[PDB]
Amino acid sequence: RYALQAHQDTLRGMMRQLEDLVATDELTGLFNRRHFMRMASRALEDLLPNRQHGLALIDLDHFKRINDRHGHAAGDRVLQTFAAVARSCLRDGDVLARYGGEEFVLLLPHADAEQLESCCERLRLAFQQAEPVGVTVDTLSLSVGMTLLYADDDLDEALQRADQALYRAKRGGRNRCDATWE
Amino acid sequence: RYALQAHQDTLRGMMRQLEDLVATDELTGLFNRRHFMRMASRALEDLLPNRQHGLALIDLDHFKRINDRHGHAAGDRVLQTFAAVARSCLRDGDVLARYGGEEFVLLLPHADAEQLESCCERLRLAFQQAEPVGVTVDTLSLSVGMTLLYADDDLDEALQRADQALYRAKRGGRNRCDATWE
Amino acid sequence: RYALQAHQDTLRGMMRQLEDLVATDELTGLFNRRHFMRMASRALEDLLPNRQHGLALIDLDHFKRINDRHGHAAGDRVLQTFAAVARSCLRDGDVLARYGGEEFVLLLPHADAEQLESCCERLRLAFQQAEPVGVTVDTLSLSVGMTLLYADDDLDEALQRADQALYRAKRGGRNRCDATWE
Amino acid sequence: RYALQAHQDTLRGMMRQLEDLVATDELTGLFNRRHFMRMASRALEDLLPNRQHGLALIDLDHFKRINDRHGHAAGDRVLQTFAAVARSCLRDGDVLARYGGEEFVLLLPHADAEQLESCCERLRLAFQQAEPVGVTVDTLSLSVGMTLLYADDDLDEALQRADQALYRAKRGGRNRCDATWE
Amino acid sequence: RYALQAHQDTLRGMMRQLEDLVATDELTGLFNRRHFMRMASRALEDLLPNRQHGLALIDLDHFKRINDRHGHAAGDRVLQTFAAVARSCLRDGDVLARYGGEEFVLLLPHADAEQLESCCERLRLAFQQAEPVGVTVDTLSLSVGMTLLYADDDLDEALQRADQALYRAKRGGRNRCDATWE
Amino acid sequence: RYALQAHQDTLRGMMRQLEDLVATDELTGLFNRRHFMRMASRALEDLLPNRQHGLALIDLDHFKRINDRHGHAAGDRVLQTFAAVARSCLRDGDVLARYGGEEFVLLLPHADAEQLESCCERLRLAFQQAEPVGVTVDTLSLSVGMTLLYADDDLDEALQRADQALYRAKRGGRNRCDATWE
């Protein structure tokens, strides 16, 4: 019995492992939230002292609104459109992942606060001119919350400040790129 | 993208295989419903022509009441009580399994309708006699619905027939055993 | 005894999952038939209404003869030749796979009947031009049979239709491309 | 490529492992040939010097003959009958396995050549009085080839001499227990 | 990538899991120390308030001296004997694990101080009376330190209690059983 | 049982397998030494008669001294730089593995003596010109020992050739490439 329970606890734990190999969201072909969590930790510890990484939270403006008028299948093709447009804007080695139903998250290896600032505009503007095929959408905009990733940073804290920057960008009228501590 | 969805689908297929290894219900120490379903299927097929298996559905009486008066922990004890009791009654090589919240299911290889009825009464009276440690019980009874698994049966159908007999045994005033096609 | 057969059956289910991870054909470096079947199924389902995929069946001409004159090792080279060539022609994101001893199969996401016919000729002429290292070839050609995967198609049926076109292209005197429903 | 091949060679090797966990023949519920091979090695090395094990090859006399007259389903129920009868004759900790379509093999921990000799008669005679249910069989007999398992023995050699004893028992009229080096 | 980092940590996660499946000491056939640790967290948790388990630490007496006088293998044989013997003495469902080189550990489910003491005595004597074979050994004995595993208890603390109790019994002359909180 | 012995050896078999999936050096992102060994048996086998592969052993120059003067992390950074650099220089489909603490190994598929030498020179110079970032480092260089991997060759012998050639280049003054049978 106790033997069976220990045994089955082992198997469940294997299942958990298997579930970590499922590292990507099929819809958008980006990495999922949990795999990002695990990747970013790994990245933060590799950082030399006095070095930084780029980190941004990306939210699609009025996404929930698109679902009602255009139905759900449309709103998903919007999400796939962001993935496509982002894949095209981003350089190799940069980390993009799907952070929530409506949100994405970014990490840029060894990136300056100006490099940071630059990429987010490029992305954001590219979503404005974005043309999701087979869906006739009136408006397309995203807002960004940025910050940086210093050595000995705490991730839950690091994510809180980019979100702050993002929420402030959401009140700033949307289609806004806002930063925290540069 | 399709290779990814295919690959992660395999991943999930492996998770399900592992699931099928988690074959027992930890509270009782009995095989779970899913594992019973898989066993019974292969006992149905391995049936020689014009031969049979016994198959009863056991339900504990007023069990929900016990949970209400004595709390969910006593409910659990009662089930470990039944599990303990049943193992004293059954011959080595019988199949007994948890089937629902308070339902169990039995399968007796090559057992006459007489043999089955004999087994179930002995089980039924054994339960009635038992006392669970650390829980004072108004009293304990169970009902059973019985039937025979024939070669070329449908297992879902066979099962439907014992549930019919279990329904009548409940209706008859509980603590009894009814049958269908013997 | 049934628990054993159930348990070992799971075991064999795991062996088959692992099988589905062995997704490529080592000689060519292309995806194998089984993996193609699993990919195409999910490309069929992911098809929006009134949209299509291209789908051709490629067969190399007089291949068996090459094995007879030049020996089974040259036969293999010719296939690595075709595999190399094809990868030069195809856009990133096409699906190409080994389908038989000498048969290959192609799938072009969102590709017009025009687009498909254009791709296949370019492939066809590219093969004709090629020379495999260390093997002197009388000459090289391939035939192809093409069709369109529609939403609500049957994949077996779709496939049956390209094999019909491939049959005619062989009949037409080889080194050509026939189609069915465009 | 080479990377893919190394990778897929890894997976095939896992499959091989999985295949070693499938350690038992379902029909007779005994261990299969390969698991016996692996078990006996393990047992031979554990042996103290000047210590022995029992080893016997068991063949059912005229088994192929039963298949013709009584059809295959009968001959299998004979095999299951031997497994049953053997399970009953044998003590706990003794190793019985299915060695071939018609043959079985035995190992007895720390067994004397007289203990050896004794068990094989008990088994053999018990198969004479054996009554395979649902099959009307005229005759039931097996022959045995025995030997022993000394320290630093070679298994392929150890199995050759018990077979010799067995083949000699097959010519000795069948229903014969013959030994090699006691 | 850092992705790569993550994916290999997962595989490493898996090996550890697979390691937890190797649950038993190969020399004796008992559960090993790690598997016991996990089985015993799980009993400690499943413990009703005002109820408890039996815990004992069993150390064989003058084992080191046995190795010197009779040789490493003879020592190993003595270990076997203790397992054999204990298997005889133990009610079904008692947990016996190898805890170290010459020390064991026993959990008794729902056992009384009085019940624990009776078991260790029956065990202490039985081992005294034993004769391993090979191996003639002049005399054997063990000493036992006991305690009770209550709810809200620390399992490592529980073991400290048992350890200390085992020390007093070694100090008190061996072939005895001391205890702590009974 | 001995059965138990067998079953845990199988699990042990599995861990080893899982270990072969950890194929890449986490610091550099290159294949590790074991994965290379396996990739290279497989190329050696797939080699047509009178045909061959390129083999080189790359050792960074005065690495130990770098660690002492700039610190362990700086050394580690230099290793990264070499990977980055080599990735740029290498045709797609070249095999580069980390072979040791400061040494690499390169297989070139179907490469000429002349082709190998050209690659190592382009590599030797490129690394000379490089600037890791962090990290200011006064100067970098490596030395290269080369040979050809023929059919019917021993891969360990091939490596001996390369090793020796690497020694002559260290001895000859470093920042060079010696060779053995070209």
Note whether C25 and C32 are within 8 A (CB). Answer: yes
Using DSSP, state whether D142 is helix, strand or coil. strand
What is the SS3 string spanning chain E? CHHHHHHHHHHHHHHHHHHHCCCECCCCCCECHHHHHHHHHHHHHCCCCCCEEEEEEEEECCHHHHHHHHCHHHHHHHHHHHHHHHHHHCCCCCEEEECCCCEEEEEECCCCHHHHHHHHHHHHHHHHHCCCCCCCCCCCCEEEEEEEEECCCCHHHHHHHHHHHHHHHHHCCCCCEEEECC
A2, A20, A43: residue with CB nearest E42: A2
Q: Count other C-beta atoms under 10 Å from residue C20's C-beta.
A: 17
Distance CA C130, CA C124 (A): 10
Note whether F146 and F56 are within 8 A (CB). Answer: yes
Residues of D in contact with C24 (CB under 8 A): 4, 8
Give chains near A: 3+ CB pairs under 8 A.
B, E, F
DSSP code of residue B11: H
The span from the first CA to the last CA of chain F, in angstroms, equals 58
Distance CA E108, CA E103 (A): 17
Residues of F in contact with E4 (CB under 8 A): 24, 26, 29
> Could you tell me which of A173, A182, A53, A144 has the C-alpha nearest to residue A107?
A53
Q: Cβ of D10 and F31 within 8 Å? A: no
Q: Count other C-beta atoms under 10 Å from residue A88's C-beta.
A: 10
CA distances to E22, F81, F131, F139 from F135, in Å: 46, 11, 9, 11
> Could you tell me which of D49, D2, D62 has the C-alpha nearest to residue D151?
D49
Distance CA B142, CA D49 (A): 59
Note whether E80 and E132 are within 8 A (CB). Answer: yes
CA distances to A131, C151, D51, F138, F145 from F59, in Å: 51, 57, 56, 18, 8
Minimal Cα–Cα distance from D2 to chain C, Å?
Answer: 9
> Which residues are within 8 A (CB) of C59 and not within 5 positions of it... i.e. 6 or more apart?
C102, C103, C104, C142, C143, C144, C145, C166, C170
Total domain count for chain E?
A: 1
Minimal Cα–Cα distance from C20 to chain D, Å?
Answer: 10
Q: Which two structure tokens, joined as six digits, stand for A57? A: 């939270």
> Which residues are within 8 A (CB) of C9 and not within 5 positions of it... i.e. 6 or more apart?
B38, B42
Note whether D178 and D145 are within 8 A (CB). Answer: yes
Backbone dihedral angles phi then psi of residue B58, each to the nearest 5 degrees: -100, 130
> Which residues are within 8 A (CB) of B48 and not within 5 positions of it... i.e. 6 or more apart?
B151, D134
Q: Which of B10, B15, B79 to mutate to test the interface with A (most CBs of A within 10 A)?
A: B15
> Which residues are within 8 A (CB) of A162 and not within 5 positions of it... i.e. 6 or more apart?
A55, A56, A57, A145, A146, A147, A180
Q: Which two structure tokens, joined as six digits, stand for C165? A: 């076109």
Note whether A165 and A116 are within 8 A (CB). Answer: no
Q: Which residues pair with E144 in a beta bridge?
A: E58, E177
Q: Can you spell out the DSSP letters for D40-106? A: HHHHHHHPPTT-EEEEEEEEETTHHHHHHHHHHHHHHHHHHHHHHHHHHHSPTT-EEEE-SSSEEEE
Q: Cβ of D93 and F1 within 8 Å? A: yes
Note whether C84 and C126 are within 8 A (CB). Answer: no
**Which CB contacts under 8 angstroms, 24+ apart, belong to B4-8?**
B4/A24, B4/A26, B4/A29, B5/A26, B5/C42, B6/C20, B6/C23, B6/C35, B6/C38, B6/C39, B6/C42, B7/C21, B7/C23, B8/A22, B8/A24, B8/A26
Experimental structure resolution, Å: 2.8
Between strands F142-150 and F52-60, the pairing is: antiparallel
Distance CA C175, CA C161 (A): 19
> Which residues are within 8 A (CB) of E141 and not within 5 positions of it... i.e. 6 or more apart?
E60, E61, E62, E124, E127, E128, E174, E175
Residues of C in contact with B93 (CB under 8 A): 1
Note whether C59 and C103 are within 8 A (CB). Answer: yes
Q: Cβ of E8 and F24 within 8 Å? A: yes
Between strands A103-108 and A30-31, the pairing is: unpaired
> Which residues are within 8 A (CB) of A182 and not within 5 positions of it... i.e. 6 or more apart?
A113, A116, A147, A148
Q: Which residues pair with D176 in a beta bridge?
A: none
Q: Which two structure tokens, joined as six digits, stand for B49? A: 């022509």
Backbone dihedral angles phi then psi of residue A57, each to the nearest 5 degrees: -100, 125
Q: Which two structure tokens, joined as six digits, stand for A46? A: 């590799």
Closest residue in chain B to residue C31, using alpha carbons only: B3
Q: Count other C-beta atoms under 10 Å from residue C160's C-beta.
A: 12
> Which residues are within 8 A (CB) of E11 and not within 5 positions of it... i.e. 6 or more apart?
F18, F21, F22
Residue with structure tokens 């379509």? D101
Distance CA F145, CA F155 (A): 15
- What was the elucidation method? X-ray
Q: Which two structure tokens, joined as six digits, stand for F121? A: 């020179």
Using DSSP, state whether D127 is helix, strand or coil. helix
Note whether F149 and F48 are within 8 A (CB). Answer: no
Using DSSP, state whether B98 is helix, strand or coil. strand
> Which residues are within 8 A (CB) of B103 and not within 5 positions of it... i.e. 6 or more apart?
B57, B58, B59, B60
Backbone dihedral angles phi then psi of residue D119, each to the nearest 5 degrees: -55, -45
Note whether B74 and B19 are within 8 A (CB). Answer: no
Backbone dihedral angles phi then psi of residue A108, each to the nearest 5 degrees: -120, 110
Closest residue in chain D to residue F38, using alpha carbons only: D6
Note whether A132 and A81 are within 8 A (CB). Answer: yes
Distance CA B103, CA B145 (A): 11
Residues of F in contact with E5 (CB under 8 A): 26
CATH number of residue C111's parent domain? 3.30.70.270
Residues of B in contact with E48 (CB under 8 A): 73, 134
Rg of chain D on CA atoms, in Å: 18
Distance CA F129, CA F117 (A): 18
What is the SS3 string spanning chain F? CHHHHHHHHHHHHHHHHHHHCCCECCCCCCECHHHHHHHHHHHHHCCCCCCEEEEEEEEECCHHHHHHHHCHHHHHHHHHHHHHHHHHHCCCCCEEEECCCCEEEEEECCCCHHHHHHHHHHHHHHHHHCCCCCCCCCCCCEEEEEEEEECCCCHHHHHHHHHHHHHHHHHCCCCCEEEECC
> Which residues are within 8 A (CB) of A175 and not within 5 positions of it... i.e. 6 or more apart?
A61, A124, A128, A141, A142, A143
In single-letter form, the type of residue at position C28 comes to: T
Q: Is A121 a catalytic residue?
A: no
DSSP-H helix ranges across chain C? 2-19, 33-45, 63-70, 72-89, 113-129, 155-171
C-alpha angle A76/A79/A83, rounded to 5°? 140
Using DSSP, state whether D129 is helix, strand or coil. coil
Domain encompassing residue E139: 1-182
> Could you tell me which of F141, F133, F1 has the C-alpha nearest to residue F58?
F141
Using DSSP, state whether B93 is helix, strand or coil. coil
Using DSSP, state whether B113 is helix, strand or coil. helix
Q: Cβ of F24 and E12 within 8 Å? A: no
> Could you tell me which of B93, B83, B84, B41 has the C-alpha nearest to residue B58?
B83
Rg of chain A on CA atoms, in Å: 18
**A to F CB pairs, distance under 8 Å:** 5
The span from the first CA to the last CA of chain B, in angstroms, equals 57
Minimal Cα–Cα distance from A3 to chain F, Å?
Answer: 16
Backbone dihedral angles phi then psi of residue B172, each to the nearest 5 degrees: -65, -10
